[PDB]
Symmetry: D3
Subunit: 291 residues, 6 copies
């Protein structure tokens, strides 16, 4: 990167200015998962980018999942799964493992990576200071809503206390578990939780890291890939798309309809994808606006 002239280095930095002004002093919620968390180089770049935002006076909030790591831990403990549809039932035993893995392993890695740059990261669940609650959720198998145990959706969010946390200079790293109204802790889909937190905090942007170039309207036609779409056109395309793209689109719909100015599905396989998406126009990924 040294054989590149200094006056092009300048222009690249200068073209970040409009996006620095747009985001200065604002909340950005970043759903972190997939490859951007398994490969060590992408991991470290992601942590650097959270430090970047913080050292620009931007307020990042990280929401993470960890489905596969839960599965691996359950197999290691020899805990036999019950499955309704393609859903593991979340017994009290499974919840304990999920919470232990998400908060006690997956979140800790990200906190330590970010904290390599300063005392920024703080790990939290809805349990801590009652920062958010859950409501138990059923799923539809074939065409019947069924109980798959202690799994929920985000209910209420302590918006004031969360924004106190970021105004102090902290980067919350959220593991998505929270008590219901009776104190019973549920596991929440990280994609959904990210949308709910962005709406509650009044985020300026929601970023969704996934392992795709962007949204394809007619996958796999290479030139069905769009770079911007309104929630109006996006919702009528939802019943079309691949199984795994559904939760990331529903999150973008709910956030942007909820008042978040834009949500973005970006390529987690790209190093520093957050920097590219936020401070560059030539980014991959697709932006969702209301319409």
């Amino acid at each position: 990167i040294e054989a590149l002239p200094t006056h092009i280095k300048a222009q690249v930095l200068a073209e970040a200015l409009p996006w620095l002004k747009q985001l200065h002093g604002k909340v950005v919620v970043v759903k972190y998962g997939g490859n951007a968390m398994t490969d060590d180089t992408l991991r470290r770049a992601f942590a650097a980018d959270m430090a970047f935002l913080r050292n620009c006076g931007i307020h990042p909030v990280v929401v993470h999942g960890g489905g596969p790591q839960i599965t691996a831990m359950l197999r290691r403990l020899g805990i036999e799964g019950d499955f309704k549809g393609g859903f593991r039932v979340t017994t009290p035993e499974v919840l304990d493992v999920a919470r232990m893995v998400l908060f006690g392993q997956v979140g800790r890695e990200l906190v330590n990576l970010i904290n390599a740059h300063g005392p920024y990261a703080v790990g939290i669940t809805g349990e801590d200071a009652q920062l958010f609650t859950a409501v138990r959720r059923s799923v539809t198998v074939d065409g019947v809503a069924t109980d798959i145990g202690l799994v929920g959706d985000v209910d209420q969010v302590n918006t004031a206390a969360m924004l106190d946390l970021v105004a102090a200079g902290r980067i919350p790293v959220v593991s998505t578990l929270a008590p219901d109204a009776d104190g019973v802790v549920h596991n929440i889909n990280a994609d959904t939780a990210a949308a709910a937190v962005a709406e509650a905090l009044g985020a300026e942007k929601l970023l969704m890291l996934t392992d795709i170039d962007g949204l394809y309207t007619r996958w796999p036609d290479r030139d069905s890939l769009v770079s911007e779409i309104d929630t109006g056109t996006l919702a009528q395309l939802l019943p079309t798309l691949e199984s795994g793209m559904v939760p990331k689109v529903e999150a973008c719909l709910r956030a942007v309809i909820g008042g978040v100015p834009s949500a973005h599905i970006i390529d987690g396989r790209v190093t520093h994808c957050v920097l590219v998406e936020l401070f560059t126009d030539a980014g991959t990924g697709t932006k969702v606006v209301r319409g």
Copy 2:
């Protein structure tokens, strides 16, 4: 408790006044472990008592261990131990399990129990916001200091940030793990960590829950049990006492010599032992002062 006259109920409450004045607005660090954490009734009373302190304008800070639960989890994962002396070596693999169990299971139980009374508890490690660091520690087997892996002592404590946390009304629940100066996370003895935190925060008292009536100078002579002792007399008795009483005495010595006005070894098998020790004169347990 209803067949007891109301005018004796009054006197019991009135006699708490001097101790309410002594502790109002002050930090109290409470090492929580042993039976007071395995039995469900003592557990819930302990959480109620932390809520009690908080609703008196007192600032409790909870430090917890969980040695046996780590051991159980390692056996379940089939992770074979290496032992030098009677010490398990803490490999990177063992540290991950310890951190996951301490922060992701043991601490979560206490956070949820306390939070049954309000949005008070917040779970933290030295990793979070770089609140404290560790320095790797060796142990003496027979008469040689030996490496038992990623185990340490508390190094530095971010006193300002910790006191910000409690002045906001939060009750930190601390899992004793922290990075060394290179970012490598170590496991810290909870008894020692409690003493270090009490000294760094300028605590008014350190409470050490154990499964004993109190300190016996000549165990097991029943009337060698003392209720107050100076650090001068206590340190010369240290090489006498039982193996498990050593870490709780060393903590009291280091805290009280470090400027903490008094440290207390109290009976964790007694329901509401914290309330009895703090707001009553007829408590069991032994108070350590400087001398």
Copy 3:
């Protein structure tokens, strides 16, 4: 109180927890008069209990009367009274004596008693910083409203400035005198003033110390004594009750209808009655709620 087991001492303290949470950070207005102010032991217990509340982060506000002491001082000065009905006319001369006795003697005793526990008590009248005003009040003798001089009801209260005072850690001790809109100072019934202050400050509770076990619906039938009553049922019983119980009931009605969640008529002859009423279920006295 030492021959009583420690585990019952614990339960008594633990059962205060719900009431500590209910009152933490809240205003409590306490009308102090009768025997709880003439006997030296009850006096000192009352002052201790105000210190108790303050060292729990509760915000007590004390309103006091002193009818008999005014009368004694007037007789000592040989000031001849004029009486309409059973009411002394409050001439400018009588007002001066009342103000001097209430603010310069009765209030000072309570300020010094409370201040034996710390720098808490501050003596105030509506005159000070214009904290509240009075409106001149007439009384009905037989069936004609008559002028009995410089006696009034509380008019407006400087709510903001009063709450500044308590948030600073002060326990106001209020002598009930205040200027009217023309600067002319009136004497206000302490029972009525206590109700008005509780409503203006948004108090969580109003406590009325009197020399009775509680409200008897059919005095003197021993088992007409109630421990809770709605303002609806209480107001229709008002024209029944004894002369001296009237002002304490009217105060409770006006406070609780005014939005104060509960008012309490409690037994001032009981040592630490405030502690018993607030932090115990087995208290005497009767609670007034809206209904």
Copy 4:
């Protein structure tokens, strides 16, 4: 005052500017007594002048005595005096009367007069919030120090809390009584108390209202009257002067030696003497500086 040209009105106001700059944001302690408090016109002008200072962003603090009113009240109550030298012994009974008269009558008049201009005045004793303490003082009769009861000198002053009070916009009106270290309330000479408060608060000026034109070095030679004197020359003149001028000079000496930049003995018989002394060069009275 209307037949005087407007351009001389202007110059009088303009010449106040240097003294407005000197005093803006500063504490001024004013000892108020003598004729400036018995005549109703001088009274009301004094209260107006305290309002004046407050509406210039100056911080007045009023200290008052009331020797004669105590005497009158004692005669009315038929309380027989004991006299050592020319000093009444202050029994507990006499103290109660003094406190009641000073705080409950004399101070209230001044609070209401000042408060005619706004919510400024607040009445205080050392009893309130432990704002200052007393130490019991003996007096020398002929040549023996003798106990004249519950009379003292100011001991310690809660400087922080007093300055909080004035920064809130309040004008403290101080009645000079305060507890000793055992809680026993003493009466303090108002002249002495004024000097002690000025030194503790770091006052810019101490004003001493008396019924004299100023300090005469050789009374009654009319042209021995000085308008400025150093503490050096003033202390060697102290054993010369009239009995009643002694306490006002000792106060000025102790304040100015204590670091108060200047103390002033001014003519309380002059209407608006405070305004003339502070904002005019052609004032009567004598200024004391260190030297």
Copy 5:
């Protein structure tokens, strides 16, 4: 001024009290121009009077013009004028000169004069921190609205930021130039700008220094001079008055109709006219109220 008795000096100062209370903590906007800025003695008195207000806790805001100095500078630079009606066209070149003269010379004199009394004055334009904007304005020559270049009216005012500035103890000295919505800086009539700033800041008074005794309803009849007039009667008199009195009346109308309690046209040829108008009843000049 020394041969005038001290007790009349007192009364002059005492009669300022009602006006000190009315203005304490309030904004006063002062349009400064005409003779009060060309003569050196009136200049220095005006600066002293701004210091006076500031050392009373009043918040002065100074708006200045400088028409003649612009003209002189343009002649010195040999810049030829274009005139439509009697209006110079404000080309970009003329604007640069106007801005340079107003902000770089006329304002600096006033800042340094005021600052002779302390660190009070700060020079500002609408350009600084975007404190206010302009909208380009046309003028009517004969009966056609015509473009006279870069001249405007005040558009929006950053009220919050302006009041931050004065609460910090600063006396803004405003040169009336401001950018339009496209960043193009316009020159604004100082009389009009003063009215707009007073309304935006919620000023208690607007003062307009002019070289007249006051408003004459039938100039030049000597006894058509009024000392108070309602906006109702004043607006119907506007089409009558002299050319140069028009802008000062329109400003008073717009301010007082805009909610400013009173606007005043006062005699700038009188030394300390501001002091006389604000703190005296025997001032010249005419007060405008709504009606």
Copy 6:
């Protein structure tokens, strides 16, 4: 700049991270002059870069000169110069022109350019709020110190008030004129003033824009150009260098010896030179450190 791959765009932004952390929350003083202020594209890039710093939570402070523009204005006004050595004497007349040009024209351009990005820029001189003073300075012609009029060096700086200004989000644009201790305004060399302000404010960096690639030790040998030098080696080279490079080196010496961690002489002819110098390693220009 669009034909350049996105993954190199990323790396350029990512490599700014260490410098964002170094400067976040810190003061940077930027001396702005030469070509970076005459060409319109470099001008606008410089203003963008000040906005850049501000939208990263960095605190830029701009100091500007304008020697040539003063000269041009003096010629236009036909003001004849007196010259001692090669120095124009600064008569009161010349000072007025200099102040008018620097504050009323040169500074206004920069304020409006910066403010195109937001309400950031505020123009100030040492005159405003007494933010800094000057001391009159003589110069050595041949070998005699001579009076060249109202030219000075920065004397004292109101550090507290200046940092209040930047913490509010303002970017001061400083025109270097200030009063001496007698209120007489002097013109200060902008290079020297920049060094003094950086030292007084505790700046993290001083940037000196000049029209050179960097410091040549043996000009004009092309490979005598250094990119870093200690103050020790730099001071012994000072008597060697070109006339115009002297003031920029003396400033760097005085700032860096004064405790400013590094001063930089950078190429003002390079677009976005500030961005390149601060957030890139491949910048031109030379860094001065202490040694």
